[PDB]
Every structure is written in structure tokens, then in C-alpha cells.
């Protein structure tokens, strides 16, 4: 299969909700080395969001059971071993994505929009490793923090405060501060400024992106309200 065939098979897999097939198609598209179009970029992001998402969801359930069964020895060991199995899958998925970002996506991102998208993505998949990492953690946390910080600097300089990629990055960096670093105030401060800056310049909303923009602002405020 050539690029166009793999992209078409990815769209079919998406419709069929076969996200492993979708991810394999887009992985192959990325390994051809050419810069991804906006469409291909979104197909890659959606595919892996769902592939890693099923493992993160399974991990959270099994971890909660493993915690809930402290007094039931047999059942807790069963839960622990299964959580570890899920973790190996989750790590392999994150390592696959971060390898694509480092080998192809980040070096070929010619425009600011793309660079911010892929650095945020790097920040995100290092954050998923950090969610399950328990001595390797500090290094993983630092790699997520460095990707997010670089993306944040470029977005504040090159993008309008209502751009969905700029808002989304502020949302996920904010989640990183709260969940991974346990800095609720630093998380709240980031989400609040992101929200207020966007409210002050709503005239900069594009018809092709206003739905994602307004959605992320609602999410930014939800996190601010929940962490307060």
C-alpha cells in the first residue's frame, strides 16, 4: 500500500472503530518520512489517542481494584500482575509514538502550528509514561515538562490566544502540573490565564476552529473549578 491507500484504510479503520489497524496505517504513513498534512496528522493523533486511551482506562480500573483489595492478599497479587501487563502495553504504545515524534514528526515540522502540535504530543505521551512510572519517573517527568514548555513558548509567540492548539496545550500542560507535579496553584494559574486571554480576544475565532476553541475553554474552566 502507497500513502493514499494507507490514509484511506486509516479512515475505514476509524469508521469501523478498529484503532489498532488505524494506528498501524498512520504509523506506516509517518515512516515514509514526508511531512504529514493536517488531515494525516489528525488521523495519526486520533488513532493513538484511542489505542493508548484503552490501556490508560484499563490501567486506572485495575489500579483502583489493586488499591481496593489491600486486605485480600490473593486478589491483590492477581490485580498487581495484570496492572503490570497493561503497563507493558501502555509503555510500548507511548515508546512507539515518542519514537515517531523524535525520528520524523518534530524534525519535519516546518510551520509553527505543526511544531506546537508535535511538542504538545511529546509532552502528552511522556505524561502517560509518568502516570504509570514508579526511579525512572523524574527523567520521564522532565522530558514531558521540557516538551510542554517549548511548545508553550512558541504558541504564546506565534498563535492567537483562541487558537485550539494553543488552548489545548495550555489545558494539557495545566493537567501535567496538577496530576504529575502536584502543583495545583501552578496548574490553576496556567488554566485561568489561558481562559481569560481567550475570552478577551473572541473576535479572533475562525469558523473552521471555533468549536474546538470554545470546547477547550470550557475544559480549562472545569479543571480550574474542580482543582479549587
Amino acid at each position: 500500500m502507497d500513502k493514499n491507500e494507507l490514509v484511506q484504510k486509516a479512515k475505514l479503520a476509524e469508521q469501523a472503530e478498529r484503532y489498532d489497524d488505524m494506528a498501524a496505517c498512520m504509523k506506516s504513513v509517518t515512516e515514509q518520512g514526508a511531512e504529514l498534512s493536517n488531515e494525516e496528522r489528525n488521523l495519526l493523533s486520533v488513532a493513538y489517542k484511542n489505542v493508548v486511551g484503552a490501556r490508560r482506562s484499563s490501567w486506572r480500573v485495575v489500579s483502583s481494584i489493586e488499591q481496593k483489595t489491600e486486605g485480600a492478599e490473593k486478589k491483590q497479587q492477581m490485580a498487581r500482575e495484570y496492572r503490570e501487563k497493561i503497563e507493558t502495553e501502555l509503555r510500548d504504545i507511548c515508546n512507539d509514538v515518542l519514537s515517531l515524534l523524535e525520528k520524523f514528526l518534530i524534525p519535519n515540522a516546518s510551520q509553527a502550528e505543526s511544531k506546537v502540535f508535535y511538542l504538545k504530543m511529546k509532552g502528552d505521551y511522556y505524561r502517560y509514561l509518568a502516570e504509570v512510572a514508579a526511579d525512572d519517573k523524574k527523567g520521564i517527568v522532565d522530558q514531558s515538562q521540557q516538551a510542554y514548555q517549548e511548545a508553550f513558548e512558541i504558541s504564546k509567540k506565534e498563535m492567537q490566544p483562541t487558537h485550539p492548539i494553543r488552548l489545548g496545550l495550555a489545558l494539557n500542560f495545566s493537567v501535567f502540573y496538577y496530576e504529575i507535579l502536584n502543583s495545583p496553584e501552578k496548574a490553576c494559574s496556567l488554566a485561568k490565564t489561558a481562559f481569560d486571554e481567550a475570552i478577551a480576544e473572541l473576535d479572533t475565532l475562525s469558523e473552521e476552529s471555533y468549536k474546538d476553541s470554545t470546547l477547550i475553554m470550557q475544559l480549562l474552566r472545569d479543571n480550574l473549578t474542580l482543582w479549587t
Binding site: 493523533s45 489517542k49 493537567v175 474546538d212
Partner: peptide
């Protein structure tokens, strides 16, 4: 946990 985007 705390919702992210996408």
C-alpha cells in the same frame, strides 16, 4: 481524572 484535549 482531570480531562485533557483531544
Amino acid at each position: 481524572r482531570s480531562p485533557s484535549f483531544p
